[PDB]
């Protein structure tokens, strides 16, 4: 994350980190329940073997809490096109449930319409992650948070060099250099409504981290809400809708 702040204990508890074969993290995720995590389908391709870790705020340290879970079944949207990062969502089903606890809580899933009218019309959303920190935040493995305002589709579609389908939405500053960067992908983009936080996006991609004129684009969770829901009931592979 470029120039945001860190998460105080308790502050960003629905954050999951995905680690690969050498216990290095590559993408992030959001905890939805004791069994499911949400991440960005592309992450499936940045490592060959990965696990999910929760309750951690410093990639090169163990403070306690820090649990590692294995995956059991993973649903990737079967309309994920590696070339467009369209339909960039996957839900993981773990093998052993999460013991929610200090610094480990889920994020809420809003209900479509309400989400549309209230969260998505808020002025900002907040994103978090453990990846690339190009700014002034001593150490490099801490968990950060950054508040990104929402951008309007016209100005999004007119900035990006590639397409913005209706499942992507843009957020970030236009000149300020604070943004989701490499290693935050998959990670949560959550909107706060009266002291409660619901997930509004999954970090998907960007054209560099904090490049002036570019914003970061996230998956439109509100366009996958029912998909997610079914996915949390089944235990299969890709599925659609």
């Amino acid at each position: 994350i470029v120039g945001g702040q860190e998460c105080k204990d308790g502050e960003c508890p629905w954050q999951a980190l995905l680690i690969n074969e050498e216990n290095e993290g590559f993408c992030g995720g959001t905890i939805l329940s004791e069994f499911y995590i949400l991440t960005a389908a592309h992450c499936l391709y940045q490592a060959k073997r990965f696990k999910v870790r929760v309750g951690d705020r410093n990639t090169e340290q163990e403070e306690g809490g820090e649990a590692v879970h294995e995956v059991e079944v993973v649903i990737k949207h079967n309309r994920f096109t590696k070339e467009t990062y369209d339909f960039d969502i996957a839900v993981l089903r773990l093998k052993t449930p999460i013991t929610f606890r200090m610094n480990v809580a889920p994020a809420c899933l809003p209900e479509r319409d309400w989400a549309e009218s209230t969260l998505m019309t808020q002025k900002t959303g907040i994103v978090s992650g453990f990846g690339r920190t190009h700014e002034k935040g001593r150490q490099s493995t801490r968990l950060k948070m950054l508040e990104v305002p929402y951008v309007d589709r016209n100005s999004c579609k007119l900035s990006s060099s590639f397409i913005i389908t209706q499942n992507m939405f843009c957020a970030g500053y236009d000149t300020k250099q604070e943004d989701a960067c490499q290693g935050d992908s998959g990670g949560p983009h959550v909107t706060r409504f009266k002291d409660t936080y619901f997930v509004t996006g999954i970090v998907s991609w960007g054209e560099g981290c904090a490049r002036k004129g570019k914003y970061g684009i996230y998956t439109k969770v509100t366009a996958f809400l029912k998909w997610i829901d079914r996915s949390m009931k089944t235990r299969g592979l890709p599925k659609a809708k």
């Binding site: 929610f100 809580a105 889920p106 409660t196």
Partner: protein, 52 residues
Amino acid sequence: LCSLDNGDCDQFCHEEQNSVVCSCARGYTLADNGKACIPTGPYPCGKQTLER
């Protein structure tokens, strides 16, 4: 109405049968006044784990 101040609900608002009916996320119960949501267990959803 909902828009106004979102019903005055803590979370979701709906309009149905000429009334405003609010609801809560999974992990919360609608409270007595019909606007607030009460946790059900120690760790709700979307709440910083402040304390313990």
